[PDB]
């Protein structure tokens, strides 16, 4: 602190800064898949089946199991508020809210929260409220990133909310014709793509969602579900990193370290494979985060 005392005063009331620890363990859970294919099956499927991507069962299913680990993982990057069943991840649904996420709370420290343009707006007609993305939920979010002086690089946007972002344009456009003498007839297209909100491009994830909190009790009991399907997540890419442990023998499969380990054989003509990894996500500095919860969708 810095108080204003008199010029012939005294010593003003000692104080000092505070730093706080952090968390996010990676020691508990994992995510795995198994095959259990025979030795006769891998042989007689070289003559009977027709397509070339079904003849080799071991080559196909190993690719078919690594790519299942990849698609069950970003599904749990927007989820994963729990435990072994989720895979040990934490998730962007709780890492971008007023919840704890590292032991640091938001009731005790109000500076560990993110910028919210929650658009439920509980004053309209009943069981519907959910006002649409007009335009002023979004240059008003940019005001709240400036008081907490951060920036952003990336927008997340479930493709239902791109469809609401795209309908903002059709309430603000009108076609025009110019340079008309004797040349070709005008030629309507009436369709348009998305450049992505001032040079900060709009990626869209099919599996993006946000589980509503227990403080939003009257919202999720008036809609039936808590997945909310309408978030934005103005994020910074260099502030959000992904971890996995390199155990000995593991190979890198598109950045994620996975370990194969064929199991032990009990009889002839049986294999019993496995494959798995161990993830963890990190969201340093809730400054560079903005959410536009509860869009009409």
């Amino acid at each position: 602190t810095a108080t204003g005392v008199a010029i012939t005063g005294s010593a003003p009331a000692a104080s000092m800064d505070a730093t706080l620890p952090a968390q996010l363990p990676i020691s508990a859970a994992s995510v795995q898949s198994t095959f259990t294919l025979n030795l006769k099956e891998i042989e007689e499927s070289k003559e009977q089946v027709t397509n070339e991507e079904l003849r080799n069962l071991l080559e196909a299913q190993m690719r078919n199991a690594v790519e299942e680990i990849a698609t069950t993982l970003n599904k749990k990057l927007y989820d994963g508020s729990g435990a072994i069943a989720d895979g040990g991840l934490i998730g962007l649904s709780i890492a971008a809210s007023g919840q704890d996420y590292a032991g640091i709370s938001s009731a005790t420290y109000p500076l560990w929260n993110v910028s919210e343009v929650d658009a439920w707006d509980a004053n309209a007609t009943g069981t519907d409220k959910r006002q649409a993305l007009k335009t002023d939920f979004m240059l008003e979010l940019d005001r709240k990133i400036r008081y907490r002086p951060g920036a952003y690089d990336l927008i997340l946007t479930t493709p239902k909310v791109v469809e609401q972002y795209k309908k903002v344009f059709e309430a603000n456009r009108s076609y025009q014709i110019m340079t008309f003498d004797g040349q070709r007839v005008p030629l309507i297209d009436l369709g348009f793509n998305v450049a992505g909100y001032m040079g900060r491009p709009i990626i869209d994830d099919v599996f993006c969602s946000r589980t509503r909190t227990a403080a939003e009790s009257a919202i999720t009991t008036a809609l039936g579900t808590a997945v909310d399907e309408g978030v934005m997540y103005f994020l910074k890419k260099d502030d959000l990193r992904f971890y996995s442990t390199p155990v000995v023998g593991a190979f890198s499969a598109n950045g994620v370290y996975t370990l194969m380990r064929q199991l032990a054989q009990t009889s002839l003509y049986v294999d019993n494979f496995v494959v798995g990894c161990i993830p963890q996500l990190q969201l340093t500095t809730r400054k560079n985060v903005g959410v536009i919860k509860n869009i009409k969708v």
Binding site: P21, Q23, L24, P25, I26, S27, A28, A29, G80, S81, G82, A83, I84, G88, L89, I90, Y101, A102, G103, S105, T108, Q280
Partner: protein, 97 residues
């Protein structure tokens, strides 16, 4: 019947055995614990010690952080005869029966 999962988010039962507690702010104000918890180091837990460890991590995570419990354990230490705190824990254990 108390059912219980550990309050840390992705660290329920670790592989290394060292369950590291999240830091909680204890005196409703001004302090911090930053505890840990080591698992089996003097044998293994014989299915009754899975209930005592169940109640130790409950009184360590969800109790010292709470401001109604710590005022309830404050008044026991302010009675008449709670000195040299082996009699404090004996005056606490008769209230829990």
């Amino acid at each position: 019947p108390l059912v219980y999962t550990p309050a840390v988010r992705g660290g329920a039962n670790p592989a290394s055995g060292s369950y590291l507690l999240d830091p909680q702010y204890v005196n409703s104000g001004v302090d911090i614990l930053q505890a840990t918890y080591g698992y089996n180091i003097n044998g293994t837990a014989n299915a009754d010690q899975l209930l005592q460890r169940d109640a130790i991590l409950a009184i360590l995570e969800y109790a010292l952080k709470d401001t109604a419990f710590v005022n309830a354990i404050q008044a026991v230490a302010a009675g008449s005869g709670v000195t040299t705190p082996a009699s404090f824990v004996s005056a606490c254990v008769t209230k829990l029966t």
